[PDB]
Amino acid sequence: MVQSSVLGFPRIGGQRELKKITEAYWSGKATVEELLAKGKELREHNWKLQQKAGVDIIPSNDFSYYDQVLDLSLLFNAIPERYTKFDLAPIDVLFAMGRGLQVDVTALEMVKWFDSNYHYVRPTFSHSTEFKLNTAAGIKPVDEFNEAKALGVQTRPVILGPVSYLYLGKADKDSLDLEPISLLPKILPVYKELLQKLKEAGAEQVQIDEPVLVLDLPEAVQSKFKEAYDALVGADVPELILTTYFGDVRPNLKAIENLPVAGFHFDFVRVPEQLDEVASILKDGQTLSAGVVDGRNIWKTDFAKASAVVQKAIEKVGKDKVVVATSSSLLHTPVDLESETKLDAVIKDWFSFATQKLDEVVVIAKNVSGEDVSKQLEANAASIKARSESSITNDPKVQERLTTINEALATRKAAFPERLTEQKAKYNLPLFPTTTIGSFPQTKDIRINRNKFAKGQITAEEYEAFINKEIETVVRFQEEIGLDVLVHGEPERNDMVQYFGEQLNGFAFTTNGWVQSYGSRYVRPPIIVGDVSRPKAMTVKESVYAQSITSKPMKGMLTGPVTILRWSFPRDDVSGKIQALQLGLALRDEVNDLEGAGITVIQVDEPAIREGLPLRAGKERSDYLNWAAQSFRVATSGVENSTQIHSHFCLDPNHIKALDADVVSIEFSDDPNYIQEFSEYPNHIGLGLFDIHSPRIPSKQEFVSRIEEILKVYPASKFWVNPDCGLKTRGWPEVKESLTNMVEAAKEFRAKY
Numbered sequence: 001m002v003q004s005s006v007l008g009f010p011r012i013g014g015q016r017e018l019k020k021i022t023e024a025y026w027s028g029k030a031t032v033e034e035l036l037a038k039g040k041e042l043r044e045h046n047w048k049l050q051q052k053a054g055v056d057i058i059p060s061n062d063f064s065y066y067d068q069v070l071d072l073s074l075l076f077n078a079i080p081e082r083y084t085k086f087d088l089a090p091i092d093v094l095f096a097m098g099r100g101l102q103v104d105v106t107a108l109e110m111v112k113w114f115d116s117n118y119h120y121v122r123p124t125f126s127h128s129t130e131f132k133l134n135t136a137a138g139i140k141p142v143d144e145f146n147e148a149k150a151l152g153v154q155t156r157p158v159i160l161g162p163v164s165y166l167y168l169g170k171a172d173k174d175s176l177d178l179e180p181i182s183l184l185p186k187i188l189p190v191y192k193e194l195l196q197k198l199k200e201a202g203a204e205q206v207q208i209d210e211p212v213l214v215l216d217l218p219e220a221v222q223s224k225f226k227e228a229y230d231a232l233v234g235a236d237v238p239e240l241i242l243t244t245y246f247g248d249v250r251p252n253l254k255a256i257e258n259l260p261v262a263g264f265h266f267d268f269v270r271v272p273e274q275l276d277e278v279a280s281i282l283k284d285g286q287t288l289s290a291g292v293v294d295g296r297n298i299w300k301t302d303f304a305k306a307s308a309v310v311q312k313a314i315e316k317v318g319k320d321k322v323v324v325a326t327s328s329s330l331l332h333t334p335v336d337l338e339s340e341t342k343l344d345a346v347i348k349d350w351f352s353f354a355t356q357k358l359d360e361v362v363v364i365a366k367n368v369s370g371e372d373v374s375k376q377l378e379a380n381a382a383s384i385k386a387r388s389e390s391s392i393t394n395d396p397k398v399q400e401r402l403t404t405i406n407e408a409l410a411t412r413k414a415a416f417p418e419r420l421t422e423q424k425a426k427y428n429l430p431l432f433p434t435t436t437i438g439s440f441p442q443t444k445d446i447r448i449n450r451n452k453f454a455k456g457q458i459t460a461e462e463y464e465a466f467i468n469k470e471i472e473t474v475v476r477f478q479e480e481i482g483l484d485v486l487v488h489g490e491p492e493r494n495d496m497v498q499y500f501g502e503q504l505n506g507f508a509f510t511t512n513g514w515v516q517s518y519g520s521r522y523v524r525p526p527i528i529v530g531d532v533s534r535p536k537a538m539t540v541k542e543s544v545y546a547q548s549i550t551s552k553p554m555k556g557m558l559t560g561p562v563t564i565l566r567w568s569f570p571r572d573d574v575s576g577k578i579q580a581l582q583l584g585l586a587l588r589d590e591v592n593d594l595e596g597a598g599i600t601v602i603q604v605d606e607p608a609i610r611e612g613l614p615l616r617a618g619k620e621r622s623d624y625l626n627w628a629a630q631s632f633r634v635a636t637s638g639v640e641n642s643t644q645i646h647s648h649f650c651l652d653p654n655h656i657k658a659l660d661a662d663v664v665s666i667e668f669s670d671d672p673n674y675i676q677e678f679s680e681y682p683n684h685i686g687l688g689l690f691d692i693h694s695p696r697i698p699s700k701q702e703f704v705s706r707i708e709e710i711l712k713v714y715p716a717s718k719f720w721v722n723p724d725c726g727l728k729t730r731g732w733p734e735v736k737e738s739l740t741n742m743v744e745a746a747k748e749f750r751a752k753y
């Protein structure tokens, strides 16, 4: 009998209960007691759900109030002194570290979890760090194991392992020379103790996550797995299942081929081809957990293909030593497809969310164990077959237009220096031209009118009028502040990816398909279901209106192809690359419509352009850098030489050059040397002058200072002046003075040239 296994379950709740209750606690509507009661109920609910599906190996310690890496830092005493000064309970210390503390500590750094859309809180270590088991609050992994046990649910605790925990961490402000991995000897006894306590509590297996194995690791780091796991493994601890996901462990195979652990987990959804070699290093007695149900996407699994993968593993190591698993934690997928009320049934039949993936690992497990599941297999085969044959997936026009992609389509009529000549003639911008990034802060009357417009209570014309008033206000604001290259404020836009996805063929949307991004901030990504195309103008009306009321140049504002791809659920039947190129072609028609309508300054926002960087150096990485840049160039390369193309980012120098934008903005407000990278590079650059997440106002002199610093490493002829990013999240008085000061700073320099 082949067991089924779930590496972690999303914890936000089927109706976002975690968000409401944690925000109610932070706001003061709810007590901490209510907070913990509600966590307990979610955990219990998710455990019963997995037991009822028939999952054998069910996780615990996967729950978190904020972030599981942060939970380990609390638990192991990786707590910087700055967070202890305020008579705080452990759970408020956790929230302090996680989200800062309004008396003003900054939150610890949030960092992207590999190439997932989740963010963790970076473990932060000092020379003074003293690792130990904080048993004050309770020991969360032991307490949550015992809870699940009292329900009659045996679970497998999940903890991030010592190597990855340290390696993914950073030396604190006060210890810039400390190498985190050098702490391995201090933290090992603390892991050992925790594992003893879990065994004592009744844990027979522990899932110990070592995802850094899918990265490029120094040889000196690779040797530490043998050191860590020789120390951890013994009779007085649970069996350890060393767990990896998101990538290829093969280059690091030497580091794990002689480890005393009870088994391994590998991701055969991202890297099925690694199976033969990883299977071959299993010792007699070791188990192989085969990750064949994707933890990061929303597509119904192909039961025949998944079973085949599992069957290849059984061949190599025997049926008794194989486990059917989710490829990673289901943290990265929405909770329940059954909550969806709007999707057409044909499309929904192609999806499985977290709750459904429980059923998938169970059926696949039954199948290779020899139980009769033909009805499920045939139902699955039909879903897969309907999807591959649907006209939605295969658009002939789009397929042909892909055949036109070549380097000529991704090259502008002339190089920057010629282009600059024609742009100077046409716009005659001053030195130190000033701009902003696009968004300005919205009114109450806006959201209310959107809602009314969605209900048909005001007409299309009435709503248009309200948007244009907002645009009018914003433009007049910018004029009077003396900005040089204006924006329309994006008041019509909810979201920089959904706004576009809704207007493209090939996308579907959910009502409830929420995934945690960080803390209590959740996203509901679009889904790319098929071939993408643009049926009509998406942004032209608003931009034409904005330009029609000022003589300043107005930026069109688009989100680039790679950002749209990376912030959506992608298709799994075609490559990232093909999806980006189709998006680039679709955006090229929009650029063409803008330019044709007189919007001849156009910004393409690519904040996530690097987020898909393949996790290892090699062919796949260099291909990615090439196609990401090509897909941007395909969108922007059909314009006239005098059309000024901008790009915004928030980051490899040379990748940025390969985009060949006339003008760049880059989140900044930080070593000077980085800027010296662009000195003999002709295109123009605006390095963000202020943090838009703060309400604080820099002085004129502040700005003058900041500019003069950059100016020592970068010529005045190329320098734009702008904020790090949009201003959608700020208040109007912060905005007014900050932009005033920014621009009068600029003019002071303008005058001395």
Ligand SMILES: N[C@@H](CCS)C(=O)O
Residues within 6 Å of the ligand: 437, 438, 439, 440, 496, 557, 605, 607, 648, 650, 725, 726, 727, 728
């Ligand atoms: N144009 C967008 C950029 C966000 S990355 C804005 O100003 O908000």
Ligand SMILES: [Zn+2]
Residues within 6 Å of the ligand: 437, 607, 648, 649, 650, 724, 725, 726
């Ligand atoms: Zn931005």
